[PDB]
Design an enzyme around this catalytic site. Structure first.
Site, short mmCIF file in Angstrom:
data_model
loop_
_atom_site.label_atom_id
_atom_site.label_comp_id
_atom_site.label_asym_id
_atom_site.label_seq_id
_atom_site.Cartn_x
_atom_site.Cartn_y
_atom_site.Cartn_z
N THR A 1 -7.08 -0.05 9.22
CA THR A 1 -6.82 0.91 10.30
C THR A 1 -6.99 0.31 11.69
OG1 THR A 1 -9.03 1.97 10.40
CG2 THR A 1 -7.47 2.87 8.78
N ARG B 1 0.82 -1.21 0.00
CA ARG B 1 0.00 0.00 0.00
C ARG B 1 0.86 1.26 0.00
NH1 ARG B 1 -1.98 3.36 4.39
NH2 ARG B 1 -3.85 4.51 3.74
#
Ligand SMILES: O=S(=O)(O)c1cc(S(=O)(=O)O)c2ccc3c(S(=O)(=O)O)cc(S(=O)(=O)O)c4ccc1c2c43
Ligand SMILES: O=S(=O)(O)c1cc(S(=O)(=O)O)c2ccc3c(S(=O)(=O)O)cc(S(=O)(=O)O)c4ccc1c2c43
Ligand SMILES: [K+]
Ligand SMILES: [K+]
Ligand SMILES: [K+]
Ligand SMILES: [K+]
Ligand SMILES: [K+]
Ligand SMILES: [K+]
Ligand SMILES: [K+]
Ligand SMILES: [K+]
Lengths: 493, 405, 405, 493
Positions: free
Chosen positions: A297, A50
Site C-alpha cells: 500500500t 494479486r
C-alpha cells in the site's frame, strides 16, 4: 558487519547488481487484465499477480486466473497468483437523502439498532458492529470514512446507543467504513463472503492468500480451516492492519506463512510516524523467523496518473528494501493506473539500486547471532552454507528443495549472491516468488527420473546460473540438498 | 549490536524518549519573520533560523536577524542564525562545471554576515575542496570562527566528498538539487553515503530540501514524506531542514511540531549503540588522548547506564566529539561562549548551558561549571538522586563518573 | 571463548572425557622389545613406536619392526613405526653450525627404513629448510609417502622455524637438546611458539625429551614432571614422547598409563573452542573450498553439539585438516590405506578405521565407508540413537550432518 | 585477544620486559634470618617475607620481624611481612620403641581412645581426631606420614575403633600426620596455638595472614574474629589444601582477601594431575574476583641443595605466571636452602621470561567480557582506564589509592604497562606487594599536605615512572584517582 561502515565504501557511480533480489507484487485490474498487458507486466518485473476480492465477481477474477496462466506459459515463466480477501468490516448504515452533514461541536448518536439501518440522519445513525457498546469506552474515538470524520464517545446513552461529539466538520454518505482505534475488535477472522471466496481460490489453485484484518494467532488457523483439506499447501500471508495485529505479531508470525505490512490500513488508526516504526519491527521479526514479508500500500501512488513519482515515494520504496522486505506491492498503480509497465520497471530499478547499497552480511551476522545453540541440523546446514558463500566468495547457490522450506531457510541468511532453487513441484516454483533472492528451476521428476543421486538436479541449477551469467569456469558454487542437510562447495566447469 | 536485533525488542506503544536529539532548521520568510511568529517556531522546535539569500535584501535579512535575537531573548534560549548563499548560476549533468566558487554577490553577502555576527554559512553549490578555501578567505579574519557548511548539489560535490568534508565544518544534503542531474534512487543512496561519512568525520550533517513539502499548503503531509523524515533520522542525520514550509507556508508551527514528533519517534527506534560501535571500530590504534577520552566517556555511559553526560567545552569541539559517538542519553555542554551555544544547535543530542565567566569566575577547579551542568540535567528531569552522570572536561582530557546527589 | 572463562566453569570431580585426543610415542629398547612387552605398551596407550638409531644395529631394529607388527596384529590395532636418525655430530651456542644435513650412516639407515616400510622419520638436528630436501632425496622415490618430522635441537632450527615447518610434515620439540645452548626458561617459550605455529600450519607437533624422566627408575614421577606433561597438552601438542622411560626403564607400562592419565585430565580442562576460533580467525578470506569445508564441519559440531565426526580420507590429509580445527568431539577417519591408519597416530583427536577396498568394494556412493565410521563411533560409545554426527568426505569437499539411527 | 595468536608473533631472542609484574614470596629460615642475608634476598627479588609458624618460637620470629624491617629501611624499600599459621592437624599417637612396621595385607586397628595415645603398636594405635568414626565410611582411605602409608577402612569395630587393611608396606614413627582424602574434616578454623600466634602477629603489625587448611567460607570469618578489632586491616590469604577448599572456593574467595594454591598439601589427597587443573581453576577465579593469588610449594625445590633446578621445575614456575598468578612462593629454598639469593634471582628471571611471552590483552578482554552490565562506577573507571592504555599505547599508569582497593582493581584488568600506586599509607605500600604489576610510592600526607587537588601525588607517581625509565617526554600516562572514580590521559613532560 555494519551498514554505516558499508556506506563509507559505496559509490553511486559503480554499476548495480547482476541480479535483483526483491520481488514485485502487482494488483491486476481494468488496466492489466488482458494477456498482452500481463505479458508486459511480467517483462517489466512482476513475480506475483494479486487479485483484490474487495471488488469484482468470480467470473471477473476467473479471467485474471486464466490470463495470468496463459501469459506465464507464453513467456516460459512461473507466476504466483494471490487471493486478497475483502475481510470483515464495520460500516455505517444508510442516510436519508444520501448525505449526513457533520458540523464541529455538534452532538450525535450512534446505535447498533437495526431499525435505523435504512433511515439514518445527522443526529442518529447505524453502525453494524453489534459489540460496539461493550468495546468502546467513553473517551474513545470512532473514525468514519477513511478516518476523515472523527467522533468522540461521551457516554453510553443506553444498551445500544452511544452519545458522541463531532470533533471535526465533514460530510459522510451511505455505508462508509468505520475504524475503532485503540479498541479490540472481535469480528470473526473470515466474513461469509470470504468463506465463499476462499473456496473459489482453492478450487482454482491459488498459490497464496493475503488474509485481511488479522488480529490474533487463533484467526490464522481459522483461515486454514476455511481453506479445507484440499488447500493445506496454500500459503497464508497475514495482513496486519491495526494495533491488535501489531500487539500480537509474534504468535501471528509463528502461525502464518508470512506477513503483509499494510501501511495504509494501519495509518488510519495509528499515527503515520509510528507505522513507519511498526514497518521496521514487523519486517525484522519476519526476517528472523524465515517468513516472507511484504511492504504494501501507498508505494508509488502518484505514478497511478503521473509519468513519474515523487522523490519521497522513491525513498519509501528503497527504505522498504533497506528494512529487509522480501516483497514490495503495487495496488491501484497496476490495477487502475495509467502507467502499468512503467511503474513496475521503476520499482524494479529502485529495488536494485537499494540492493546495491545494502549490506547483506549485516543480515547474515545479525540473524545468525540470534540463533539458539544447539541449532537443529536444517538450521546449521543452511547458515553454514551461506557462511561458505562469504568464506569462499562464491558466486551462486544451488538449493534442492521440494516444498520450498530449505530454499526459504537459506534465503533467510542473506547470501550476497543469487540463490537457485531446483524443485520437483511447480507450486513451489510459484510460491517462492514471494521470497527474496531466490529463482526457481522446475525438474520434472516423473519425466526425467527420481534423481536419487541428485546429480541431474544439481546440474540443472548450475546450468541456469551459467545461463544467467552468474557463474563461469573457475567460480565456486555452494550446493545444498537433501529437509535438506548436505552441502558441497562445487567448482564450476 | 545491530538495528535488526534492536527492532525485535521494540513496541510502538512504549513511551518515547524524554529528549529529542535531532535538530530542526527553519527557513525564515514572510509568514515567519515577525518576533511573535519566531516565538511560535522556537516553541514548536526551531533550533536554527535560516536566511535564504537567493531572495530578499540586506535590510530584509537584517529584520530576520534582529527579530530572531529578540524572540530568543524573550524565551530565554539561544537560537542559531544561518546564512544560505545564493551561489553561482540550466544544469549540466555529465559535465564538470568550473563556475567561480563564490559570486560577487556572495562575497558581499558573506561580509554582511560577518558584520552581523552570523553563526554559520550554508555555502551553495560546492564542487571541490579549494572552493571551501574561497568561502574562508571571503569571510576574512574577523569571521574565522564562523562555521562553513557545504551544500552538495551536483555529482562533483559527491565525487569529491572526502576532500570537501575535511575542509568544511559540515555538510548539507540537498536532495532536490541533486535530483536534477542524478536519478532519485541514486540520491537516496548518496544521502546514506554522505550522512555516514559525516558521522565518522564527526561533522554535522543536514538533510535538506523536499522534507515535508506537501505541508506548505496542506494541514498534513503525505505518508511517504513522513517516512522520508524518519529515515533521514535513521540514516544518521544531525539536522532536518524546512524550506518553503516555514518561509512561505500556511502552517509554520504545525509542520515544525510534526517534524519534531517524527524525529522523536524515529529516535525511539534508533539504536545509538550501532553508531557508537561502528564509529569506534573504524578508529586507528593508537588513538589520540582526546579521541580516546571521548569514546571512553560514551562507552562508560553504556556500561553504567548513565542517564546524562556533562561536557565542558569552550569551542564546542569536544561537545561535537562526544556526540559523534552517540550515547543513548542527553549530552549537556557547559560553555563560556554564547556563540558555541548557538553553533551547537546543528549537532545532535547536545543541549547547551551558558556559563558567564565574566560575571561569576574563571572556575579553574571547574566545580561551578560541572554543577551548573548537573543542575540543568536535573531541571530537565534527565537525572535524579542515585543516577550516574558522565562528566568530561579539561583538548578535554579528564573523565569523571559522578553520582547525582 | 578463552581458557580463562572456561577455567571458571570447571570442577576436578567431574568425570573425564570419554576419549583421549593427545597421542603417546614410546621409544623401544631392551626392556620393551619383546612382543609381550609391546602388547603391554599398546594396551597402556602406545600409538607410535620409536626406534633410536643412535644406538643399536639394523638387525636389532629389524626385531623392533617385526615384533611391533606382530604385537599390533594380535591386538587387532594399527601402530606407527618411527625411525629417529642418529644425525650429524660438543656444541656451539652463538655460532651457526653448517654440518651436513644427513650423515653417511643416516643415508644408509634411511634406505633401511624405506625397505622396511617405516611410516615416519624423526630427522635429527634440522637447522634449515634445504636440510629437509636432503632427507627427502635420501629417502628416494620409493619412500615419498613417508612423513618427515623435523627435530628442532638448536637456535638455527628455531630461527628458521617457518621455512622448516613449510617443508616438513611436522615438528619435534626436543627440550633437552635445546637446553644445552638456550636457557631453560626460553625453551619453555620456544615450546609454545613452535607448538602454536604447528597448529596453525595444521601439522603434527611432538613434545619430546625430559617428559617423565624420574619414572625411569622410580614408581612415580615428580609433581613438576606431571605439570610439564599437562602443560604440553595445554600448549597444543599433538603428541607426547617417552625416551628412556620405556626403552631402558623399570616401569614401561606404568609410565605410559600415567602419561595417558595426565593427558586426559589436561584435555578435560582444555578449551578446544579457543583453538578452533583462533585458527579460524587467522585464515585469509577468500578461503579454498577444502579449508572452508573442514572449518565449517568443526563449526557445525559446536553449533549442533555433535558427539562425533566421520572423515573419509585416503591420504589422511583432510583427517589432519579437520583435527587442525579442534572439535570438542572424537574424529573418526575412514581410510582405504593401512599406512594412513598408522600415520594418523601422530595427529590428535583422530581414530582410524581401515576399509578394505580390495575385498569389499570401491564404494563410489561412499555409503559403506560412512556407515563403517558411524558403527565404530557407536562401538566406542561416542554416539547413540538421536545424536548428531558430522560427516565430511569427497580434497574432501562434501559435508553431511547426520542423525544417528 | 588470543595467546595462541600471540605465540605466533614471538621470538625468544627479543629483549625481555622493562619491568617484572609477578611478585616473589621467600620463606625466612636459618639461611636467611640475618640482616645481610635479607638485604641480599631483597636485592635478588623478594617482595614478601614469609614466617612459617609450623616451626620456631615467638622470640625467633620476632628477630625475623625486626631484621626484615631493618633491611627494608636500609635499602629504602617497603617489604610485606606474612604470618603463615600452623593450622589444625590430625596426627597419630606415640609408639612403643618409636616404630610401627606396617606390612602389606596386614590388619590393624585405629582408635580415637586417648588411653592408647602413649602406647601404640603395629596392631592398634591412636589418631587424635575425635570425629574419625563418624566421618570415615568403610571403603575410605586413611593416609599416614605425608600420604606414604595407605590404610583402607574395612569396618567400624566399635564406637571409637576402626578395622583397617594395610595396602602398602611402610614403617611409621611417633606423631606422624594423617590425611582423610574424600572425607569432610570439621576441625575448627584455628587451633589453640593459632589463636596465640595470630595475636602476636597483630601486636607486631604483620601485613597479612596465610591461613592454613581453609575448608569453608565460615572459617574465613573465624580467623577475622581471632585477629580482633586491632587487626581488621590485616589481609587474610586462605590456603586451599584439600577437596573441601576446592569444592567451596567460590564463597571462600568472596570472604578472603586472597588465595594460596598449596600444591604440595593438595597433592597428598588429590592426584597430582588434578591439582594441576585445580591450580588453573583457582588462579583464574581469583583473577576474575580481583584478589591476589599465590602459587606455592614445590616451586624450585631441587635448587634447595643444587646450584641449578630441573627443567620441569622452571617450566612449572613459568606456567604459574601463564596461569595468571599474582605471586610465586619459595619455602625451603630460602629458609633452609644453600642458594638463597640464587633461587630468587632465577625465579625472577623465569617470571620475567614468561611475562615477555604472556599476552595481557587476553586477560583484559576475558575479565571485561565477564563483567555484569550495568557496571558500578569503580569497576567502569578502572577497566576503561586499562582500556585507554591499550587504546593509546600508554607506557605507565598512576593510581591514587589509600587502602589499595582501586590499585588492585586496576591490576585485575592487566595493562601491558607498569602500574604506579601513590598512597598515603605504608601498610598499603606493603600489602600491595602480593599484587602483580603494581609498585607503590609513599606520600606523607601529614607532612606534605592533604593534596585535595591531587596535583602533588600525581606528580610523585609520574616522577617514579620517569626514574625507572618507564615514561619520558611525549609518552602517554593514564592517571586514575578519587574509592577512585576519575581518569586522565596525561601527556608526560
Ligand atoms: O456463518 S455461516 O455462513 O452460517 C457459516 C458457514 C459455514 S460452512 O457451512 O462450513 O461453509 C461455516 C463453516 C465453518 C465455520 C467455522 S469453522 O472454521 O468450521 O470452525 C467457524 C465459524 S465461526 O463463525 O467462527 O463460529 C463459522 C461461522 C459461520 C459459518 C461457518 C463457520
Ligand atoms: O579453645 S580455647 O582455647 O579455650 C578458646 C579461647 C578463646 S579466647 O579466650 O578468646 O582466646 C577463644 C576465643 C574465641 C573463640 C571463638 S570466637 O571466634 O570468639 O567465636 C570460637 C571458638 S570455637 O572453638 O570455634 O567454638 C573458640 C574456641 C576456643 C577458644 C576460643 C574460641
Ligand atoms: K481493509
Ligand atoms: K549488496
Ligand atoms: K541553488
Ligand atoms: K533510542
Ligand atoms: K641428538
Ligand atoms: K575439553
Ligand atoms: K599443612
Ligand atoms: K607481555
Amino acid at each position: 558487519m555494519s551498514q554505516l561502515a558499508h556506506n563509507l565504501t559505496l559509490s553511486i557511480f559503480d554499476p548495480v547488481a547482476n541480479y535483483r533480489a526483491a520481488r514485485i507484487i502487482c494488483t491486476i485490474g481494468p488496466s492489466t487484465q488482458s494477456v498482452e498487458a500481463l505479458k508486459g507486466l511480467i517483462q517489466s518485473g512482476m513475480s506475483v499477480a494479486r487479485m483484490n476480492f474487495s471488488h469484482g465477481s468470480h467470473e471477473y477474477h476467473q479471467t485474471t486466473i486464466n490470463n495470468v496462466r496463459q501469459a506465464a506459459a507464453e513467456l516460459g515463466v512461473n507466476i504466483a497468483i494471490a487471493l486478497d480477501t475483502k475481510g470483515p468490516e464495520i460500516r455505517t448504515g444508510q442516510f436519508v437523502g444520501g448525505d449526513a452533514v457533520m458540523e464541529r461541536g455538534a452532538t450525535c448518536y450512534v446505535t447498533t439498532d437495526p431499525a435505523f439501518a435504512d433511515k439514518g440522519t445527522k443526529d442518529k445513525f447505524y453502525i453494524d458492529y453489534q459489540n460496539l457498546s461493550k468495546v468502546v469506552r467513553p473517551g474513545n474515538y470512532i473514525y468514519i470514512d477513511d478516518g476523515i470524520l472523527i467522533l468522540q464517545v461521551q457516554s453510553h446513552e443506553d444498551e445500544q446507543t452511544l452519545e458522541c461529539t463531532v470533533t471535526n466538520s465533514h460530510t459522510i454518505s451511505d455505508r462508509r467504513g468505520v475504524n475503532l482505534p485503540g479498541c479490540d475488535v472481535d469480528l470473526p477472522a473470515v466474513s461469509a463472503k470470504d468463506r465463499v471466496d476462499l473456496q473459489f481460490g482453492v478450487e482454482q489453485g491459488v498459490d497464496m492468500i493475503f488474509a485481511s484484518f488479522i488480529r490474533s494467532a487463533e484467526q490464522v488457523g481459522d483461515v486454514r480451516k476455511a481453506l479445507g483439506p484440499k488447500g493445506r499447501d496454500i500459503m497464508i500471508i497475514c495482513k496486519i492492519e491495526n494495533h491488535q495485529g501489531v500487539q500480537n505479531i509474534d504468535s501471528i508470525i509463528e502461525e502464518s506463512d508470512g506477513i503483509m505490512v499494510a501501511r495504509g490500513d494501519l495509518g488510519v488508526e495509528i499515527p503515520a510516524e509510528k507505522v513507519v516504526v511498526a514497518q521496521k519491527i514487523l519486517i525484522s521479526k519476519c526476517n528472523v523467523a524465515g517468513k516472507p514479508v511484504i511492504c504494501a500500500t501507498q508505494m508509488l501512488e502518484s505514478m497511478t496518473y503521473n509519468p513519474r513519482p515523487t522523490r519521497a515515494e522513491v525513498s519509501d520504496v528503497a527504505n522498504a528494501v533497506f528494512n529487509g522486505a522480501d516483497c514490495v506491492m503495487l495496488s491501484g498503480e497496476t490495477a487502475k493506473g495509467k502507467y502499468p509497465n512503467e511503474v513496475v520497471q521503476y520499482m524494479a530499478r529502485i529495488c536494485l539500486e537499494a540492493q546495491s547499497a545494502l549490506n547483506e552480511y549485516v543480515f547474515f551476522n545479525s540473524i545468525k547471532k540470534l540463533q539458539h545453540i544447539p541449532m537443529s541440523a536444517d538450521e546449521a546446514v543452511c547458515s553454514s552454507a551461506v557462511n561458505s558463500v562469504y568464506e569462499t566468495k562464491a558466486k551462486a547457490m544451488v538449493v534442492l528443495s521440494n516444498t520450498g522450506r530449505s530454499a526459504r531457510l537459506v534465503a533467510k541468511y542473506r547470501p550476497n549472491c543469487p540463490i537457485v532453487c531446483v524443485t520437483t513441484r511447480l507450486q513451489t516454483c510459484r510460491q517462492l516468488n514471494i521470497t527474496q533472492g531466490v529463482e526457481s528451476v522446475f525438474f520434472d521428476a516423473d519425466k526425467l527420473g527420481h534423481d536419487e543421486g541428485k546429480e541431474h538436479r544439481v546440474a540443472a541449477g548450475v546450468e541456469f546460473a551459467k545461463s544467467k551469467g552468474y557463474v563461469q569456469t573457475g567460480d565456486y558454487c555452494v550446493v545444498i540438498h537433501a529437509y535438506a542437510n548436505q552441502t558441497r562447495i562445487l567448482l564450476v566447469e
